[PDB]
Amino acid sequence: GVLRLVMELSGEMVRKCDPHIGLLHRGTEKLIEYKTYLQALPYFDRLDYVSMMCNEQAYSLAVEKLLNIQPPPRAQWIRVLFGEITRLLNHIMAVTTHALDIGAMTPFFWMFEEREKMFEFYERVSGARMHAAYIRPGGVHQDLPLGLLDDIYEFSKNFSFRIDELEEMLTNNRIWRNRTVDIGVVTAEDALNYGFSGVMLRGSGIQWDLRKTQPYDVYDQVEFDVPIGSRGDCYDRYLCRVEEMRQSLRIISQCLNKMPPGEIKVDDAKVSPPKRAEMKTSMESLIHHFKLYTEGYQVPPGATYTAIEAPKGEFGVYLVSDGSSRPYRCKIKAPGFAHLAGLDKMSKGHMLADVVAIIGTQDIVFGEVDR
């Protein structure tokens, strides 16, 4: 709804595409420069608003790498589980909105009921249905409420049937195959060099995935498969997304089985706020709470670039700290920026409906594109 596209056509073909991004630019990086490290978390929460907890996790990983601290194992497992839940949310949104643009809406409504249930999980764990601000540098804000894992298990039980119902309407449909097959074909070298990451690379056939090549949190303790495309088109990307949903279900099952006990934030009151009882009974805890919530913890001077495998590709944060309690520089690399830059390459020799399909398969969020 915030996309302006200038297209030069030759009768029916599309000879030139020019995306005029910038309709959702808000100066997020400068605002982050003016905020502190804790006050900048919701900014990442609002960058890619289908992968909110994934963006929170990326920012938390960057800040923790700068601080040279380590989250507890239970916090890491919770972060991985909710990252997989958010990946399910994002893939559902992408596939359903792609179909909604190309015709079909009933899978949109079904999978959005499923999204409503996952938002109920989000609200139970955080209190906010969309922008949890739950994953923070040093762990997570609060422990899981009792009985949440049982509901997550029930949802995981009753989701493969939903995926199968979605596939019954689109996978073998000849209309869907006509709309998606051999459209937006991109070679492996061109995809890379234009700067592609994630689903685009997997569809083009490149065996690359950050969760397996550069593991973070406890992603190296779970078993899952990486879908690989063969023709590098919209249909292959759709199949890859569906298989990624199934693999994320498997990872969720593993996390539910192997959730460990312990604390949920780093036991370092100079970084993570102390508990309320300790703050109300201990002078050191009160001082640390006061300082953390007024000035904020200082981060040693340096510069880091941390990237994670967000559901839309490689999401990266380049954080530059000058030793103060506020970040000096914060560059946000969103996967959709390079994809929308490469939209013109993929739209050659196609039509308007093909351009719509290419945008849908690129799965562009203009919030993260513009920042």
């Binding site: 179909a99 015709g103 079909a104 079904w110 449909n173 209309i175 006509n178 709309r179 039509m351 093909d354």
Partner: protein, 309 residues
């Protein structure tokens, strides 16, 4: 009494169009796991009235750079031709019994094509004009296919009389006889009415009252197409002493076909323009010609030529 018959043919059609809008919304909701309008009235039986009242008491936006003559004529022509195609339909007795009723339907549809072109050319906007041109091309192609199919079907009827169609279908169903023609006829009617998966135009300049005229014309055309298909391929038994049985059966079949239209719209994605154009000229037209040849040859080779009278 003839004016009374005309009004009894006209007004219930408009009421059925409004409640068809309501039924379509509810059926789409229940297929999409929603509920549909159930708030405005008891089980939602006031939504068409509310929509009609709002559209009537809504401000129009007639463009300054527009031909007022065409801008007024196009909805009038569309609605008049939508209402006209109900007078030769027998249920079981047509209002106007014509010796050649089918050709009247074909001519009325061919004239009804003009409304899209005139509405597109009235707005004096390039993009709406291009959309209208694409719609015209799609409609004329599927008109060719519909004409060939309808010619093929009537070779087992013996004439262009729908009463003779009923008499022919007294025993068994033309859908049993010629089901591939039924498939192609149903798809071509979908494409002609521009319902999904062929709603390329809606996938704009008119608003408020004149928009409602086009909406009513389109839905009346949909109902008329379903009724014609039910008569042509799903012929019911007619008893001269109790005609109401045939009327009930025909109405049930028409409702089933319209509900199938809504079902297909809910179920399927949208075709691309060139894809649906290649669907006809390269997949439907050759099969239509082959089946036309087969249905010409069949009565001669089986000594089953229908009577002219």
């Amino acid at each position: 009494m003839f004016m009374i018959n005309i009004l009894s043919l006209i007004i219930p059609i408009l009421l059925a169009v409004a409640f068809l809008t309501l039924v379509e919304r509810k059926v789409l909701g229940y297929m999409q796991l929603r509920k549909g309008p159930n708030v405005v009235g008891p089980y939602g039986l006031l939504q068409p009235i509310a929509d009609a009242l709002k559209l009537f008491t809504k401000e129009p936006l007639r463009p300054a750079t527009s031909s007022i003559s065409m801008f007024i004529i196009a909805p009038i022509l569309a609605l008049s031709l939508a209402l006209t195609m109900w007078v030769p339909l027998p249920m079981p007795y047509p209002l106007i019994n014509m010796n050649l009723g089918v050709l009247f339907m074909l001519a009325m549809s061919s004239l009804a094509v003009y409304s899209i072109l005139w509405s597109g050319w009235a707005s004096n906007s390039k993009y709406a004009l291009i959309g209208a041109l694409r719609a015209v091309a799609q409609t004329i192609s599927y008109e060719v296919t519909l004409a060939i199919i309808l010619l093929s079907v009537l070779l087992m009827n013996g004439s262009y009389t729908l009463s003779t169609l009923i008499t022919t279908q007294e025993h068994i169903w033309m859908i049993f006889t010629s089901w591939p023609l039924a498939m192609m006829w149903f798809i071509s009617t979908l494409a002609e009415t521009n319902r999904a998966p062929f709603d390329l135009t809606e996938g704009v300049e008119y608003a408020a009252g004149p928009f409602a005229m086009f909406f009513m014309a389109e839905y009346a055309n949909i109902i008329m197409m379903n009724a014609f298909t039910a008569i042509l391929f799903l012929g019911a038994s007619h008893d001269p002493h109790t005609p109401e049985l045939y009327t009930i059966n025909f109405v049930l079949k028409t409702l089933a076909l319209t509900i199938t239209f809504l079902w297909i719209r809910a179920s399927y994605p949208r075709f691309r323009y060139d894809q649906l154009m290649h669907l006809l000229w390269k997949s439907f037209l050759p099969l239509t010609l082959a089946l036309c040849m087969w249905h010409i040859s069949l009565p001669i080779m089986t000594a089953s030529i229908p009577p002219q009278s």
